[PDB]
Design a protein around this ligand. Structure first.
Ligand SMILES: [Cl-]
Ligand SMILES: [Cl-]
Ligand SMILES: [Mg+2]
Ligand SMILES: [Mg+2]
Ligand SMILES: [Mg+2]
Ligand SMILES: [Mg+2]
Lengths: 405, 405, 405, 405
């Protein structure tokens, strides 16, 4: 019945504890949709991609035509793929699915096949300077009812490492108006992680799922070894073992370890993962609605993965807004090959700016049953938190060589 | 708002010109859905699969949970895949999507991404005893506005061959209460088809799309040769070149010809086509909503094909009911990598039994905009046409060897 | 001399402790043959496939022409392969071999190359709630003279798991008029099986063959790990490690463990196993006469397997009738690459309905030396046990996701 | 009922127009079986293999146990495979199948699945010094009702070539008490064959099947070219294009031509053909009952070939005795993937020594319906034709280099 045309769209930028960029699409029927467009450390490039280029092309279009607009933006940009490009496309896609649900009077998961499960298992983030500190935090997460917990500890002798900070229920690495410089030592790291997992199993037991993020810092043969060393402790996954622009990079890892492997939070399209999937080089795909081209495209990534029993493990750090989390949870509740959802808690100010229907209890989340995504933005409140430039950190080897953070 | 539970389901069997089996699923809200379950020549095996086994398990279920029921039936059968199994699953799936659209107040294509195109290109079926007869019929189809036409002619010296009969706008091969026996000669066939295409281009010109169905009758190296011989005439596709249970069977064909290849009307799951697709051995995938596990599963087949620029070419013979055609047209209007839709006209009695919203004009079809699939069944009218046993034909070589029909 | 034509055939359905479907083919010479057509949980779909479609085509045919009828039904169905299709074909094939033996005055094994061995080694089924319970039952089987024993134990903390029940010499999972729902936890399972095998070797010693059925519940990399963990205990096989519709699914398993692998009880044709065999991904093929197209086709599966030193390990649960067991034992005694035969004991009522010549003693079976298969059906007795609907169970993960049973 | 033990066996050697070696196996029930053991040009090596080694091991064995004796001889020889070894094994195997049929009171084809066809298509042999001579002979074969004809012509400027002689309905190359020396020129040959096929199609037309035997004389890239040059004339096959000990040798041929390829008359086991078959490098497999390990083993070769739509094309030159031809025709009538049977006529003296039931009419043969193979040997008549040493020819290049005949 309702046949809404897009009449206006705008980018809202706000910093309630950290930067978020949001797309709002309005139709002539008064129904609107929201999409996350946040790209941590490069936020204003996406805002411009949208405001200056994409939005003008949205005006007048049939909001029902989700696939058509996806293809129009993907093919029509001419220069294909990429983090800025695909995040802009995701934002439009999310917003259109939001609108579709509102028109249908159904939550988005009902449009994607309905619920495949009763709730969405998440993991939280235990970090500490020492192994003892890390295990103590993990015990707290376990008591709170988390079924899965990521472990990150300090590397002895090294001032910093990925995932360790003063924050407990999250990790906010974009912490400075210029990139914070870190120093990395692979040898020390390879020896500490197995000791961490040993101590963790001793205190937590064997039912809880234990995860670890390598954060791009190993070569393939080094990752193969870390895998071998962690097998005794049965990790749920080892994530981002080695840079993956070359999709053959995981071959040596898979040849040498049975530790389950996860990758892809920085992937922006199926083309970044096609060979990793088809060659059975990974067990979990980490791509997200916001960074890999929205619900439309993420469903295709998941479908390819399903053929090889690879499961979804969407990235869920703080730099994905509650709009992204809402979309992710609708995707998670409905996708058949769901694995796990990452859950870092947002600041209270963030929750206030983005009121939402999704809930967390007893280690499980649910997207809620409001029409569409079940999320909104309080524009008046958002206007009170001005953008503040903040970069992700960089990492160098001890001789000064640029390395992977 | 509406949360319908399945309260009853039943199989309706009717023969308005030919046999059709239809599943009707009723919910406690009064909304119902329809699914085609027709499996030509083996119809009552699916009716029993549904009535005796599947239907009892449907009662009480949440009709919104399409994916859950698909997986429940697919995995839960224990014995996986197969023509009877997957047709029963398709029928349930179609019916649930029908219900979903009705609940949403939207035509099904609006749930599958919206319209990717303004209409759906179809092909019709020109057949004749001689090449001259065949080309004359093709000229009529072309004048009627068909943009694409399948050509089948008699093989000189042979009493019968696939696709040639007294019927003009369709072909009804299940014509006897025991399988009609045919005699096949490959040598004569390989020499006639290139002469047919030569004559066709001479009269029809080069804009019209010309198709040919080999109907499983060649070895791979023979199909490679027929391809080479047809390249000059630029066929839109050569279909079912060789039996494909062995998915390596298309390798020699693809090595030796650039004629576009189509296969898969008899496929019932993605597992029948995964290697043909990933190895780039075909250009069009012919699997249908009714025989390959419904909309849910056919979308996954299409998504895999899309990665390799392979397009959909759904089978559309008379033994797929208007319920299947409605679903196919919703799929066709929304799938991004649509290629073509086969369209054989149904008998008037069939149209009367299955009133529908889909339309045909100027070589193009459209699913219409009624909620759900836009199809119904007139049960009182259906009851007046009793089931009549009818088998597909068989084919033997001249020495009597069982062969492929 | 005798040249029998088929004059009639019929499907007999009976439930002497569980459902069985049997095909009886009568010839004009008075000689008849029997074939099992039982497809657990979907029985009436095969009965209809036979009664309504296949049987009409059998009438008048030369019963000597076994290959011709196999090809006629396989190719002639048009829609190829599948559990209902291939079980119907198997039933006809078994019945025709039965007839052939009767005409020749020889047991069927004498037509298949003669005896390759003096008897057929079988395995029995030890199950228990605890490891201690399971090992105690295994000790009893070992004392009874079984040379091979399958071990299944409960998963601590989980109400149910595959293969564990109150029944000792068999396992009857189709136990309800709707599918029983189960809840699955992979983590707990992966830790219990190695403890079971450790305890088993401690009590049983190292000569006995010990088997385990994973029953489709692991991903490939998980199965690789379970394999690594079980190698110390030298399992005879680990069965159905991961769903195998994708035949590449066993690649990661084979890469990482030397535990012998078995698969295929649910396969219905050689096309389900060709790549698993040719790529040397398994050690035993489990396909059966009744579900994979009869003696004619199972011999071809075994011949392909033989080239790679892969051996037969026919499935032998209670849902394969004594008619199937008779055929299996004739196949087993004659096939060169025989590995083992599964043997679950039938209820006394079942044995009464299907009198047979095959015997069991000291862990070994033999098909007997009666003409044909050496099995009959007491139709009067069968008529007293009416069909009773019963489904195989389903399995879900703890979040409710449909999973593999 | 009858359970015959082998009591004696003997080798009969006779030369009714050419050398034949025959194995006769006698049982204590008085039933006997015959097997061909003729290995052209090396006949007495097989006679000794049998008389001195195999026969002593046969005495006392259960004649019903065909598979057991096959494996016993194949594995038990220790030194596996080979022309002398496998011909001895074939002779035993043929003789045991002969016995099995006699015991069953059935012709052998009835034990191998029954008849798959009404008769067996054969090809005859047209040869001439000039192309004109060759085509004239072919016209005669065509008039006589042959559906398929091999063409061999002289190479202009060359005194001899394979397949050309004064004999019309056969070719007897083992013609001297020392190997006849021939001189070969590849260049001249590559230019003459396409002219032969051109002339043949001009006179014979396009329905008849036309075959050509390259007889091992080309390199792969040369065979690829000859294939390309013959495609216009649609040869039924091009046989033995290049020596095939290296099974990769056919790769370049298959890459470059769609002419159908045949190989394998000199193969003695499936191991000589496994890769040619699995890599889809040939269309017809030419191995015979007598040289590739009998009926038992040839059925396995055919079954592997069937998976790839490769058909049988048994070699049938005069040096295979009527005992072999009888076995071949029982195999041919029953094998599902039959392609064609070679038929060279034997001398009248040969037919007198080996009375048989098989017949030829109108280009088709049939094994007949006598129990067993339907062949016998007249020992008194055989005794009147003494062995006469005769070698196959050799071939050298013009510089004297040893080459392939
Ligand atoms: Cl970019
Ligand atoms: Cl089926
Ligand atoms: Mg990460
Ligand atoms: Mg077709
Ligand atoms: Mg099992
Ligand atoms: Mg030759």
């Amino acid at each position: 019945s309702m046949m809404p045309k897009i009449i206006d769209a705008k980018v809202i930028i706000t910093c309630p504890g950290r930067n978020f960029v949001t797309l709002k699409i309005m139709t002539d029927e008064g129904v609107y949709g929201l999409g996350d467009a946040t790209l941590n450390g490069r936020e204003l490039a996406v805002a411009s991609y949208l405001t200056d280029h994409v939005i003008p092309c949205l005006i007048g279009r049939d909001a029902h035509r989700i696939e058509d607009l996806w293809q129009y933006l993907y093919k029509g940009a001419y220069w294909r793929r990429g983090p800025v490009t695909m995040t802009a496309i995701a934002a439009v896609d999310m917003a259109l699915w939001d609108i579709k649900g509102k028109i249908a009077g159904l939550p988005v998961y009902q449009l994607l096949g309905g619920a495949s499960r009763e709730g969405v298992m998440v993991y939280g983030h235990a970090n500490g300077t020492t192994i003892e500190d890390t295990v103590k935090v993990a015990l707290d997460y376990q008591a709170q009812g988390y079924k899965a917990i990521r472990l990150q500890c300090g590397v002895p002798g090294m001032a910093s490492t990925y995932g360790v900070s003063k924050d407990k229920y999250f990790y906010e690495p974009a912490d400075a108006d210029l990139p914070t410089e870190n120093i990395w030592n692979t040898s020390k790291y390879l020896r500490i992680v197995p000791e961490l997992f040993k101590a963790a199993r001793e205190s937590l037991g064997w039912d809880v799922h234990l995860l670890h993020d390598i954060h791009h810092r190993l070569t393939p043969i080094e990752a193969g070894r870390l895998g071998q060393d962690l097998e005794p402790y049965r990790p749920f996954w080892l994530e981002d073992a080695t840079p993956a622009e070359n999709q053959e990079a995981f071959r040596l890892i898979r040849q040498h370890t049975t530790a389950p492997l996860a990758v892809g939070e920085i992937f922006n399209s199926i083309w970044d993962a096609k060979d990793l999937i088809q060659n059975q080089l990974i067990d979990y795909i980490r791509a997200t609605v916001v960074h890999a081209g929205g619900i439309t495209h993420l469903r295709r990534i998941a479908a390819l993965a399903d053929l090889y029993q690879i499961r979804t493990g969407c990235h869920g750090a703080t730099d994905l807004s509650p709009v992204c989390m809402a979309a992710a949870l609708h995707f998670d509740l409905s996708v058949p090959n769901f694995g796990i959802q990452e859950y870092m808690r947002h600041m209270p100010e963030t929750d206030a700016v983005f009121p939402h229907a999704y809930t967390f209890a007893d280690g499980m989340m649910h997207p809620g049953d409001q029409p569409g995504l079940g999320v909104d933005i309080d524009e008046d409140l958002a206007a009170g938190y001005e953008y503040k430039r903040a970069f992700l950190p960089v990492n160098r080897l001890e001789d000064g060589t640029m390395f992977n953070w």
